[PDB]
Amino acid sequence: SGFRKMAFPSGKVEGCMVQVTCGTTTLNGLWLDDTVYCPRHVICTAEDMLNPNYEDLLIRKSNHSFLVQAGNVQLRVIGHSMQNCLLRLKVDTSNPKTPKYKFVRIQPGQTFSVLACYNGSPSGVYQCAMRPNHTIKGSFLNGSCGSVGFNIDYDCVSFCYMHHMELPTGVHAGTDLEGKFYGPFVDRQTAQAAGTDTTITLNVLAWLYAAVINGDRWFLNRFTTTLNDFNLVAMKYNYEPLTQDHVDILGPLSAQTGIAVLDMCAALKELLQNGMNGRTILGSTILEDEFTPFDVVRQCSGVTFQ
Amino acid sequence: SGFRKMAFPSGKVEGCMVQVTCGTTTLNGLWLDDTVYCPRHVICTAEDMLNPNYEDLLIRKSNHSFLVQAGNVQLRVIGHSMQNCLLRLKVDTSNPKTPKYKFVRIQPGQTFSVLACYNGSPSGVYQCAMRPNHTIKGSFLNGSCGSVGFNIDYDCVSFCYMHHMELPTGVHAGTDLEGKFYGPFVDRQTAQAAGTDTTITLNVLAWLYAAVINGDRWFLNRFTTTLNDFNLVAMKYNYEPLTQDHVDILGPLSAQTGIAVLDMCAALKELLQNGMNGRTILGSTILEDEFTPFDVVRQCSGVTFQ
Ligand SMILES: Cc1ccc(S)c(S)c1
Ligand SMILES: Cc1ccc(S)c(S)c1
Ligand SMILES: [Zn+2]
Ligand SMILES: [Zn+2]
């Protein structure tokens, strides 16, 4: 039946994207009710970025220093304030397309959909995982700042990421919708770099369960393992240590497949020590760590192929 | 800067999805202007599928044998006809969310975005390539029939696929929006199976160009090759033969990177004969064939890293 990295339908978010311009800088903003949220560096010039003092740069702006464009309409700013690394612009109009929503700060290992945008116009959508090192391997070009990440539950959009910068290795960093950065990054020019990363163990296990639900059992084995013995192998292969909380989370998947979590860990240990011998799992030649246990339950059938 | 399999924003299509029920069968339909399009097998029962005569099964239905639900509203059918493998239901209301659109029959190797839907409610979006063997490796569960594939240019939605069935190997088959199947498949129960497939050479080359644009040149070499000598290697590795039309298509990418097409073919030939030696390209350990030259130009920077 297939297994794909799928994103949430993006319509509810497309209706919230606008363009924000201050001086010569234009980037994207998120328009919810009567507020537009955007990266605070929209107020900076290239030189400002070397050592910007945002409090000082901002007090020098007025409400009209900001130009907000929604589609083909101009929104009038009637207030502004800084909240951590974001600017909150109050506008004269409430977005009629505002969806039911909330702001959530996602945890490392969790996934979300990104709606890449330029000049307030959505251009593409794809799924990303927040890495343990607090970066995401997105696809972004100049002008994408302010693009957002989100999940959708029922008809409530949980916004969890706003894009702010690209690091030397080509990976990306940003904030939650309260403007607090994920990771130790800052919105200014420094020698900052992505720290060391690690494979998301819980997700790789979830994905092996997805492969079984979809009818594949070739990588299973007759062994079991202790959490501690598993972690000795995990440390060697740069996998996050597995905890009992992670084992508990895998409970439902374990029950749907009849495969005990620690027995699946034994299967993983063997895959790490012996490789995959030219075989594939769910079409992949490598162990995938960008699907959470939740993503698997969402996409896979509730009935294992058996 | 990253490279992801990204789909087109799905909003314009979400506003067109509805549910169509005939008897005990419910699947998805596409509502454009005053017409709803859906798989004709919605009129069949399980037994009907063994050897259905659609002309005979359909003449036995009336306009009211069909229930069309848009969100929470019931649409009244005032006409119906069969067009190849689809049903075209005329309804009493014109969709106010109808986007500018057109129906296109995509060619093998080309890509499109799929909006997976159930009960007329969009659940996810992902990018697929139409394989040379006319199937797509989608992610679909029971109830997904009628889900559509599309591309978006400017603000015109080009619909190119409607989902109808899953084959024994777990891959998927469907039709264009005139109801003609892609491939030799039929909407009934038979021993039909996906034919042999092949790697999409032109796309793998496009992707190697994307990797160079993004700053990576490790797999290049000092050799060149003739189209014929390249094809002898392609035949051995089950790659589609490269033609001069394919070489011409790669012209712009070749110019942006300063790498002659046949020299890039020499690089591919070497990658196929020697493997990738534990290295990755654009984060991948394998040669990717699901990005067209058009997808690359769309997502990559217009300035090579150099
Ligand atoms: C050069 C440059 C211009 C605009 C933005 S928003 C950034 S992050 C960098
Ligand atoms: C069992 C079954 C029920 C409904 C549809 S639309 C199909 S394709 C198969
Ligand atoms: Zn920026
Ligand atoms: Zn069906």
| Residue showing tokens 């979006």 | B125
- Nearest CA to A208 among A275, A131, A293? A293
Please give the class, per CATH, of domain A1-14+100-197: mainly beta
* Annotated catalytic residue within B16, B41, B44, B85: B41
Ligand nearest to the Cα of A164, by number: 3
Contact B26, B20 (CB under 8 A): yes
- Best A3, A5, A6 member to test B by mutation, with max B CBs in 10 Å, is A6
Contact B85, B187 (CB under 8 A): yes
- The residues, any chain, with a CB within 8 Å of residue B149's CB and separated by 6 or more, are B106, B112, B113, B114, B115, B128, B136, B159, B160, B161, B162, B163, B174
Which helix (H) or strand (E) element contains residue B273? helix B261-274
Contact A128, A9 (CB under 8 A): no
Contact A252, A219 (CB under 8 A): no
Contact A171, A163 (CB under 8 A): no
Chain B: closest CA distance from residue A5 (Å):
7
* Annotated catalytic residue within A22, A38, A41, A128: A41
Relative to beta strand A156-166, strand A100-103 is parallel
Burial of A291 (0-12, 13-18, 19+ CB in 10 A): buried
Contact B152, B200 (CB under 8 A): no
Contact B115, B125 (CB under 8 A): yes
Distance CA A92, CA B60 (A): 57
The DSSP string of A179-199 is SPBSSS--SS-SS-------B
- The residues, any chain, with a CB within 8 Å of residue B24's CB and separated by 6 or more, are B45
DSSP state of B63: G
A25 Cα nearest atom in ligand 1: 4
Structure tokens, A127? 């799924």
Cβ neighbours of A277 (radius 10 Å): 8
Contact A82, A66 (CB under 8 A): no
Contact A43, A91 (CB under 8 A): no
Beta bridge partners of B22: B25, B66
Nearest CA to ligand 2 atom 7: B142
Contact A235, A241 (CB under 8 A): yes
Relative to beta strand B66-70, strand A77-83 is unpaired
| Residue showing tokens 């990576």 | B216
Annotation: CATH topology of B198-301 = main proteinase (3clpro) structure, domain 3 (1.10.1840)
Q: Is the CB of A145 under 6 A from ligand 1?
A: yes
Question: Is residue B254 classed as helix, strand or coil in its secondary structure?
Answer: helix
End-to-end CA distance of chain A: 14
Domain with CATH 1.10.1840.10 in chain A: 198-301
B27 Cα nearest atom in ligand 2: 6
Distance CA A213, CA B241 (A): 37
Contact B65, B47 (CB under 8 A): no
Angle at B125 between CA B103 and CA B299, to 5 degrees: 80
Chain A residues within an 8 Å CB radius of B141: 1, 301
Beta bridge partners of B37: B30, B88
Distance CA A168, CA A180 (A): 21
User: Among all residues of chain A, which has the CA nearest to that of B121?
Assistant: A9
Chain B: closest CA distance from residue A67 (Å):
24
Distance CA B198, CA B289 (A): 10
Beta bridge partners of B82: B87
Distance CA A224, CA A226 (A): 7
CA distances to A152, B104, B110, B150 from B174, rounded to whole Å, are 28, 14, 15, 13
With the most atoms of ligand 2 within 8 angstroms of its CB, the residue from B142, B144, B165, B188 to mutate is B142
Burial of B277 (0-12, 13-18, 19+ CB in 10 A): exposed
Q: Is the CB of A22 under 6 A from ligand 1?
A: no
| Residue showing tokens 């990771």 | A183
Does A77 lie at the interface with B, CB-CB under 8 angstroms? Answer: no
Does B1 lie at the interface with A, CB-CB under 8 angstroms? Answer: yes
Q: Which residues does a chain break follow in chain B (C to N more than 2.5 Å)? A: none
Contact B219, B208 (CB under 8 A): yes
Q: Report the separation in Å between the CA atom of A143 and the middle of ligand 3, taken as the mean of its atom positions.
A: 7
Beta bridge partners of A28: A19
Between residues 13 and 72 of chain A, which touch chain B (CB distance below 8 Å)? Answer: 14-15
Burial of B274 (0-12, 13-18, 19+ CB in 10 A): exposed
* Residue B156 annotated as catalytic: no
Does A171 lie at the interface with B, CB-CB under 8 angstroms? Answer: yes
- Nearest CA to B53 among B63, B64, B67, B43? B43
Chain B residues within an 8 Å CB radius of A8: 124-125
Distance CA A210, CA A291 (A): 10
Which helix (H) or strand (E) element contains residue A26? strand A25-32
Q: What are phi and psi of B140, to 5 degrees?
A: -140, 140
CA distances to A112, B6, B16, B72, B290 from B111, rounded to whole Å, are 23, 11, 21, 33, 7
Q: Flag if B1 and A170 touch (Cβ within 8 Å).
A: yes
Distance CA A67, CA B9 (A): 25
Question: Is residue A281 classed as helix, strand or coil in its secondary structure?
Answer: strand
- The residues, any chain, with a CB within 8 Å of residue B226's CB and separated by 6 or more, are B262
Q: What region does B234 belong to: left with phi over 0, alpha with psi -120 to 50, or beta?
A: alpha
Chain A: closest CA distance from residue B138 (Å):
6
Q: Is the CB of A25 under 6 A from ligand 1?
A: yes
Beta bridge partners of B74: B69
* Residue B38 annotated as catalytic: no
Please report the beta strands in chain B, taking only residues with DSSP state E, as ranges in sequence order.
Answer: 17-22, 25-32, 35-39, 66-70, 73-75, 77-83, 86-91, 100-103, 111-118, 121-129, 148-153, 156-166, 172-175
Deposited experimental method: X-ray
- Best A113, A139, A197 member to test B by mutation, with max B CBs in 10 Å, is A139
Distance CA A184, CA B294 (A): 37
Chain A: closest CA distance from residue B237 (Å):
15
Distance CA B186, CA B192 (A): 8
Does B252 lie at the interface with A, CB-CB under 8 angstroms? Answer: no
DSSP-H helix ranges across B2-107? 11-14, 54-59
B26 Cα nearest atom in ligand 2: 6
- The residues, any chain, with a CB within 8 Å of residue B107's CB and separated by 6 or more, are B130
Domain with CATH 2.40.10.10 in chain B: 1-14+100-197, 15-99
Nearest CA to ligand 2 atom 3: B25
CATH number belonging to domain B15-99:
2.40.10.10
Q: Is the CB of B93 under 6 A from ligand 2?
A: no
Structure tokens, B273? 């004969």
Contact A37, A88 (CB under 8 A): yes
User: Among all residues of chain B, which has the CA nearest to that of A280?
Assistant: B286
CA distances to B50, B139, B242 from B245, rounded to whole Å, are 43, 32, 8
Question: Is residue A56 classed as helix, strand or coil in its secondary structure?
Answer: helix
Distance CA A167, CA A185 (A): 9
Contact B171, B137 (CB under 8 A): yes
DSSP state of A170: S
The DSSP string of chain A is ------BPP-HHHHTTEEEEEETTEEEEEEEETTEEEEEGGGG--TTGGGS--HHHHHHT--GGGEEEEETTEEEPEEEEEEETTEEEEEESS--TTPPEEEE--PPTT-EEEEEEEETTEEEEEEEEE--TTS-B-----TT-TT-EEEEEETTEEEEEEEEEEE-TTS-EEEE-TTSPBSSS--SS-SS-------B-HHHHHHHHHHHHHTT--TT--S----HHHHHHHHHHTTBPPP-HHHHHHTHHHHHHHT--HHHHHHHHHHHHHH--TT--BTTBSS------HHHHHHHS-SS---
Does A115 lie at the interface with B, CB-CB under 8 angstroms? Answer: yes
- Cα atoms found within 13 Å of the Cα of residue B81, Cβ hemisphere only: 4
